[PDB]
C-alpha cells in the first residue's frame, strides 16, 4: 500500500477503506468535506455474476453502461482462470464474474437483474538487474549531493542492526513492475544504517536504481543531500522493536522525523513535501497533524491524517481475513493491484531461496507488460481540463474511458477551497458530483508501448 | 471493587482575570517542595499566579499534605499530558506557560529526554501559541525540539539544558 | 522558575557562561554537520568585542594600593574608570592567620575592607592586539 501511494498519493487510504465494511447514512449537518469523505468510506468491493445481456460486448462498454444506468462501478472481471483489472478489448463471456464497488451487497444485485426492456524476470512482470553489489550502492553525503535526484522516492528507515527484518523487497518491487518503462522508473534511495540493510540486500540485488545512504533520517544534512524537497514521496518506516514502556512513546522517532521535514526550509517549504508514515500504535496519529481536533476514542479511518493519505497502520488490514473467507478472488484482486503482479509461479521461485531470477524475453513475455496500473492525473491542464472548469464526475468518467481506456476510481480534493495544501480521498463519487479545476483523479491507465 | 471515589479529577474551575501555569513531568515530593519554595518566595515580586500540577500516579501522603498547605495557590489533577482530554481539564490553552520537569537522577538520560520531548509535542499539538519551558538532559536532544514547526524562541519557548549549563 | 518570570534572565546566563551562543549558531549545529567555519568580515571581527569573565589579584599592580588600605567601593570605582572592568565579588582566604582555601563573597558592600591577598571577580573588556 505504501509503494502504491508513491505513484498515486492517497491510494493507501482509498484501498484500505474499500475492504473495511462500513454502513454510511447521511448526517443532518457537518463539514462538507467530512460528508464527502464519509460517503466514500461506505463503499466496499462485491462480486456479482454479470447479466446475460452483457454477453458479447467489450469491457469498456460494459463498465460504462453499469456506471450510467445501474450506478455501479465495475473495474475487474474474471476470465477463464485469471482476474483482469480494466481489460482492454476483452469480451464478456457467459456467467462472467465481475468486481463492483458499491455501498452494499444489495446494490450489486442490480447487475444480475438487468435487461434491455536479461531485462526482466522469469515471469516478465518486473525489471531485472545483474545482481549489483551493496558496496557499489553506498553513497556518502557528497556523492548524493552532486547527483541529480528529481521525482525519486526516499525511504526513511529507523532500524537497529539487530532489528527484525521487514519486507523491504515488498516495497521496491511494486515500483519496479513491467508496467513502467525503464526511463519512467522512480529512483529509490534508502536512508538508514547499512548494517541493517546488509541483511536485506539479498532480495534487492537484482532491482535496478537503488541507492543506500548511511546515516539517520532525523539529521537535516542527510535529508538535504537526497533532496527531499524534490522527492515524489517520502516514506517513514521503523523496524525497531517496541520497548512497551508507553504506547504514546512507541512512535517517537517517526513523529519527530515527520515534524522535522515539515519545518524544513529549502531555497519552497518542507510542509509541501508528500509524506507517508506508518504507525505501530494507531493512537499516535493525533500528533501527525496540528490543525485538527484530536479525540482519543475516534477511529483511525475517521482521523484527518488518515483521510488525507498521510498515515497508515496495520490495524486497518484486520478486515481482510473476513473478506478473504467469503471470496477468495477478492484477495487475489488486492494482491495484483498493489504488488504490481505477483503470480504464484513467482512466489514458487522466491521460495527456493536463490532470490529473484532473471529470464530472456520471449514473444509472450513482452505481452505480460500490457496490463493496467494505478496512476493519478490532474484536471488543471490537458484535454480533460474542460471537465474541471464546469464540473461533472459522470461526464469525466465516460470521456476518459472512451478516449484512453482510463477508469476513474475516485478524487483527491483539497480540504479547503478558500489555505492548506492538504487533499482528502473521495471514493467513487456520484455521477452528479461537481468537479474543481484543482482536483486530482485516481485512474487505472492502460500500458502504452513506446 | 467499589473502592473510593477519585480524589483528584474533574476540570479546573475557570475564573475571570486569573493566571495559572501547568507543571508536568517528574512530579515528586522533593521536586514539588523545592519548586514551590522558589516559585513562592517573598523576596520576589508579588504576582497572583497559581500552579496546576498534572501527573499520572496519585500522590502519596507526603505530597497530599503539601498540597493542603498551599490550598489557595496550588492545584493538583490526575492525568497525563499525552491525553488531549487531560489537557482540556487543566485548561492548557488558557495557561500562561507550561513547565516540564525532568528526572535528573535517571538511569537513561536518552530515555528521559525522549519522554519529555514527546510531552512538548503533545502540548504543541493541542495548541501552538502556548509558552513551553522544558528541562533537557543532553544537548544533542535539543535539535529535535528546535526542528518542531511550532517551536518559537521569540514567543518565549525555552530549553534549559542541564548538560550545557553544568559544563558551562 | 527564574526563566518563567523573565525570559531575558536565561539569555543573560547563557551568554555569560557559554562564551556567546547566538540562536543562529544553534541552528547551524542542529543541522548535524558540526561546527562550521567562516571567512572573517568587517562585522565578524567586531563580534569579538565583548566582556568576558576574569579574575584579578590585588597583590601587585596599579590596583594593589586598594588592597593595602581596603575599601571595596573605592576599588569598584577606580577599576571602572581606568579600564572599564566591573567588580562582581571577592575570592578571599578562609583563614587570615594556614590553608590555601578561598571562599566566594558576592557583591560586598562599598564599606567592605579589602586584603592584600584578595582576588576580585571582574568583567574585563576585550583589548585588541
Ligand atoms: Ca457499506
Ligand atoms: Ca492533531
Ligand atoms: Mg468501506
DSSP notation for A20-65: S-------SS--HHHHHHHHHHT-EEEEEEPPGGGTTSBHHHHHHH
Longest dimension (CA), chain C: 56
SS3 B128: coil
B86 alpha carbon – ligand 3 mean position (Å): 32
**How far does C35 lie from chain A, in Å, by closest CA?**
13
Q: Where are the beta strands (DSSP E) in chain B?
A: 19-25, 49-55, 74-78, 97-101, 131-136, 158-161
C3 and B160 in contact by Cβ < 8 A?
A: yes
The span from the CA of B168 to the CA of C20, in Å, is: 11
| Calpha distance A143→C129 (Å, rounded) | 43
Q: Concatenated DSSP letters for A401-422?
A: HHHH--EEEEEEEES-------
Q: Which residues contact A170 (CB under 8 A, 6 or more apart)?
A: A3, A339
Q: How far is the CA of B159 from the centre of ligand 1 (A)?
A: 50
Closest Cα of chain B to A338: distance in Å? Answer: 33
Contact B146 C18 (CB under 8 A): no
Buried b (16+ CB within 10 A) or exposed e, A132-153: bebeebebebeebeeeebeebb
**Resolution of the experimental model, in Å, one decimal:** 2.4
- CA distance linking residue B132 with residue A214, whole number of Å: 34
Distance from C-alpha of A402 to C-alpha of A385, rounded to nearest angstrom: 16
Give the C-alpha separation, A321 to A325, whole Å.
Answer: 6
Distance CA A251, CA A242 (A): 9
Dihedral angle, C-alpha A26, A31, A33, A35, nearest 10 °: -10
Core vs surface per residue A63-81: b (16+ CB within 10 A) or e: bbbbbeebebbbbbbbbee
CA distance C16 to C37: 22
CB contact under 8 A, B99 and C10: no
Measure the N-to-C terminal CA separation of chain A; round to a whole number of Å. Answer: 28
Beta strands at B19-25 and B49-55: parallel, antiparallel or unpaired = parallel
Helix (H) or strand (E) holding A108: helix A105-112
3-state secondary structure (DSSP) of residue A389? helix
- The interface residues of chain B toward chain A in range 10-69, judged by CB-CB distance below 8 A, are none
Kindly list the distances between the CA atom of residue B21 and the CA atoms of A21, A201, A240, B96, in Å, as whole numbers in the listed order: 46, 53, 37, 5
Q: Which ligand is nearest to the Cα of residue A427, counting in written order?
A: 3
CA distance A235 to A258: 10
Given a contact cutoff of 8 angstroms between Cβ atoms, the answer to whether B79 and B89 are in contact is yes
Which residue(s) pair with B98 in the sheet? B22, B132
| Alpha helices (H) along A113-190 | 141-145, 169-172
Cβ partners under 8 Å of residue C22, min gap 6: none
**Chains in contact with C, counting 3 or more C-beta pairs less than 8 Å apart as contact:** A, B
Rounded to 5°, the CA angle B81-B87-B91 comes to 135
Compute the radius of gyration of chain C from its Cα atoms: 19
Task: Name every chain B residue with its beta carbon within 8 A of the beta carbon of A256.
Answer: 117, 121, 144, 147
Q: How far apart are CA B99 and CA B158, in angstroms?
A: 10
Name chain B contacts of A290, Cβ cutoff 8 Å.
Answer: 124-125, 128, 149-150
Which residues between 72 and 111 in chain B have a beta carbon less than 8 angstroms from any beta carbon of chain C? 97, 99
Q: Which residue of B has its CA nearest to A253?
A: B114
Cα(A354)–Cα(A374) distance, integer angstroms:
30
What SS3 state is found at B153? coil
Closest CA to A76 of A95, A91, A98, A93: A98
Angle between helices A328-338 and A11-18 (to 10 degrees): 180
Task: For residues A34 and A63, give the distance between their C-alpha atoms in angstroms, rounded to a whole number.
Answer: 28
Whether B112 and B102 have beta carbons less than 8 Å apart is answered as yes
For residue B71, the SS3 value is: coil
Neighbours of A230 (CB within 10 A): 15
Distance of alpha carbon A223 from its chain centroid, rounded?
24
Residues of B in contact with A251 (CB under 8 A): none
For residue A426, the CA-to-ligand 1 centroid distance in Å is: 14
C-alpha cell at position A299: 477511529
Residue A52 contacts residue A69 (beta carbons within 8 Å)? no
* Residue B142 near residue C30, CB atoms below 8 Å: yes
Q: Which of C92, C104, C87 is nearest to C53 (CA)?
A: C87
Distance CA B12, CA B19 (A): 12
> How much helix, strand and coil, in percent to the nearest 5, is found in chain B?
35, 20, 45
Beta strands in B30-165 (DSSP E): 49-55, 74-78, 97-101, 131-136, 158-161
Name the strand (E) or helix (H) holding A83: strand A82-85
Long-range CB pairs of B67-71, under 8 A, 24+ apart, other chains included: B70/B36, B70/B40
Out of C10, C17, C30, the one facing B146 most closely (by C-beta) is C30
| Strands (DSSP E) found in chain C | 52-57, 86-93, 102-106, 119-124
Type and span of the H or E element at B118? helix B109-126
Q: Are B107 and B79 in contact (CB under 8 A)?
A: no
CA A97 to chain centre: 24
Whole-angstrom distance, CA of residue C49 vs CA of residue A226 = 40
User: Measured in Å, how far apart are chain C's first and last C-alpha atoms?
Assistant: 42
CA atoms of A325 and A328, how far apart (whole Å): 6
The three three-digit cell numbers of residue A277, written as one number: 508514515
Q: Distance (Å) from the C-alpha of residue A270 to the closest C-alpha of chain C?
A: 15
Helix or strand run (H / E) with residue A324: helix A320-326
Angle formed at CA B112 by CA B110 and CA B117, multiple of 5 degrees = 95
| Grid cell for residue A285 | 496519529
Contacts 24+ apart (CB under 8 A), B108-115: B109/B137, B109/B138, B110/B137, B110/B138, B110/B141, B111/A245, B112/B137, B113/B137, B113/B138, B113/B141, B114/A249, B114/A252, B114/B141, B115/A246, B115/A249
Strand order in the sheet with A153-158: A138-139, A210-214, A188-192, A153-158, A233-238, A275-278, A311-312
**What are A434's three cell numbers?**
461537481
Outline where C6-100 has alpha helix (H): 7-17, 23-31, 64-69, 72-83
CB–CB contacts below 8 A, B to C? 35
Q: Beta partners for A445? A: A373
* Contact criterion met (CB below 8 Å) for A298 and A258: no
Is the C-alpha dihedral spanning A207, A213, A216, A219 positive or negative? negative
- The Cα–Cα gap between A66 and A101 comes to 11
Dist. CA A43 → ligand 3 center (Å): 5
Mark A334-343 as b/e (b = at least 16 C-beta within 10 Å).
Answer: bebbbbbbbb
Nearest beta carbon to residue B168 from set C5, C17, C30: C17
Spatial strand order of the sheet with C86-93 comes to C52-57, C119-124, C86-93, C102-106
- Chain A nearest-CA residue for B80: A248
DSSP string, A185-236: PPPEEEEE-HHHHHHHGGGTTT-SSEEEEES-TTSHHHHHHTTGGG-SEEEE
In angstroms, the CA C15 to CA C52 distance is 10
Return the residue in A142, A145, A213, A221 with the most chain C beta carbons within 10 A, the one to mutate for interface testing: A221
CB A98 within 8 A of CB A85: no
C-beta of residue A34 within 8 angstroms of C-beta of residue A67: no
What would the grid cell of residue A2 be?
Answer: 505504501
Residue pointed to by grid coordinates 452494499: A104
First to last CA, chain B: 54
Chains A & B: contacts with CB separation below 8 Å = 51
Amino acid at each position: 500500500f505504501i509503494a502504491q501511494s508513491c505513484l498515486a498519493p492517497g491510494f493507501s487510504t482509498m484501498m484500505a477503506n474499500l475492504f473495511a465494511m462500513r454502513s454510511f447514512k447521511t448526517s443532518p449537518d457537518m463539514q462538507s468535506w467530512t460528508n464527502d469523505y464519509l460517503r466514500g468510506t461506505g463503499m466496499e468491493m462485491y462480486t456479482e455474476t454479470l447479466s446475460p445481456t452483457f454477453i458479447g460486448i467489450p469491457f469498456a462498454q460494459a463498465t460504462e453502461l453499469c456506471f450510467s444506468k445501474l450506478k455501479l462501478l465495475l473495474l475487474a472481471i474474471e476470465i477463464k482462470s485469471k482476474i483482469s483489472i480494466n481489460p482492454r478489448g476483452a469480451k464478456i463471456q457467459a456467467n462472467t464474474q465481475g468486481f463492483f464497488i458499491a455501498q452494499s451487497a444489495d446494490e450489486v444485485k442490480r447487475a444480475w437483474f438487468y435487461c434491455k426492456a536479461m531485462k526482466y524476470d522469469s515471469t516478465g512482470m518486473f525489471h531485472w538487474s545483474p545482481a549489483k553489489s551493496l558496496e557499489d550502492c553506498i553513497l556518502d553525503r557528497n556523492q548524493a549531493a552532486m547527483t541529480v535526484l528529481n521525482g525519486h522516492v526516499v525511504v526513511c528507515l529507523f532500524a537497529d542492526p539487530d532489528s527484525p527484518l521487514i519486507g523491504l523487497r515488498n516495497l521496491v518491487m511494486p515500483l519496479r513492475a513491467s508496467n513502467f518503462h525503464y526511463h519512467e522508473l522512480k529512483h529509490v534511495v534508502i536512508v538508514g544504517s547499512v548494517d541493517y540493510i546488509r541483511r536485506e540486500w539479498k532480495m534487492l540485488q537484482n532491482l535496478p536504481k537503488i541507492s543506500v545512504l548511511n546515516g539517520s533520517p532525523l539529521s537535516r544534512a542527510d535529508l538535504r543531500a537526497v533532496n527531499v524537497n524534490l522527492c515524489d514521496m517520502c516514506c517513514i518506516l521503523s523496524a525497531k522493536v517496541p520497548s512497551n514502556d508507553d504506547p504514546t512513546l512507541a512512535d517517537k522517532e517517526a513523529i519527530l522525523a515527520s515534524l522535522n521535514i515539515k519545518a524544513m526550509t529549502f531555497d519552497v517549504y518542507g510542509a509541501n513535501v508528500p509524506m507517508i508514515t506508518e504507525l505501530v500504535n494507531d493512537g499516535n496519529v493525533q500528533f501527525l497533524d496540528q490543525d485538527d481536533d484530536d479525540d482519543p476514542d475516534t477511529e483511525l479511518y475517521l482521523t484527518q491524517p488518515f483521510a488525507c493519505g498521510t498515515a497508515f497502520a496495520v490495524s486497518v488490514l484486520d478486515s481482510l481475513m473476513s473478506t478473504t473467507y467469503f471470496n477468495q478472488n477478492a484477495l487475489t484482486l488486492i494482491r495484483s493491484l498493489i504488488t504490481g503482479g505477483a503470480t504464484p509461479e513467482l512466489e514458487l521461485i522466491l521460495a527456493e531461496g536463490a532470490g529473484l531470477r532473471g529470464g530472456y524475453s520471449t514473444v509472450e513475455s513482452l505481452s505480460n507488460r500490457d496490463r493496467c496500473r494505478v496512476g493519478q492525473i490532474s484536471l488543471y491542464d490537458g484535454p480533460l481540463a474542460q471537465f474541471g472548469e464546469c464540473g461533472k464526475y459522470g461526464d469525466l468518467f465516460v470521456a476518459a474511458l472512451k478516449s484512453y481506456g482510463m477508469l476513474c476510481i475516485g478524487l483527491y480534493r483539497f480540504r479547503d477551497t478558500s489555505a492548506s495544501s492538504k487533499r482528502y480521498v473521495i471514493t467513487n463519487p456520484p455521477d452528479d458530483f461537481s468537479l474543481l479545476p484543482t482536483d486530482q483523479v485516481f485512474v487505472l491507465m492502460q500500458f502504452d508501448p513506446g | 471493587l467499589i473502592g473510593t471515589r477519585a480524589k483528584y479529577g474533574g476540570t479546573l474551575k475557570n475564573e475571570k482575570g486569573r493566571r495559572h501555569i501547568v507543571v508536568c513531568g517528574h512530579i515528586t515530593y522533593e521536586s514539588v517542595s523545592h519548586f514551590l519554595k522558589d516559585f513562592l518566595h517573598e523576596d520576589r515580586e508579588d504576582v497572583d499566579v497559581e500552579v496546576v500540577f498534572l501527573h499520572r500516579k496519585p500522590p502519596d501522603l507526603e505530597l497530599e499534605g503539601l498540597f493542603k498547605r498551599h490550598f489557595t495557590t496550588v492545584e493538583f489533577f490526575q492525568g497525563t499530558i499525552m491525553n488531549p482530554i487531560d489537557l482540556q481539564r487543566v485548561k492548557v490553552h488558557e495557561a500562561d506557560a507550561c513547565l516540564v520537569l525532568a528526572n535528573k537522577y535517571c538511569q537513561d538520560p536518552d530515555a528521559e529526554d525522549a519522554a519529555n520531548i514527546m510531552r512538548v509535542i503533545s502540548i504543541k499539538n493541542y495548541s501552538d501559541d502556548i509558552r513551553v519551558i522544558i528541562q533537557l538532559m543532553q544537548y544533542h536532544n535539543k535539535a529535535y525540539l528546535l526542528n518542531i514547526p511550532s517551536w518559537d524562541w521569540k514567543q518565549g519557548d525555552d530549553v534549559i539544558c542541564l548538560a550545557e549549563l553544568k559544563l558551562g
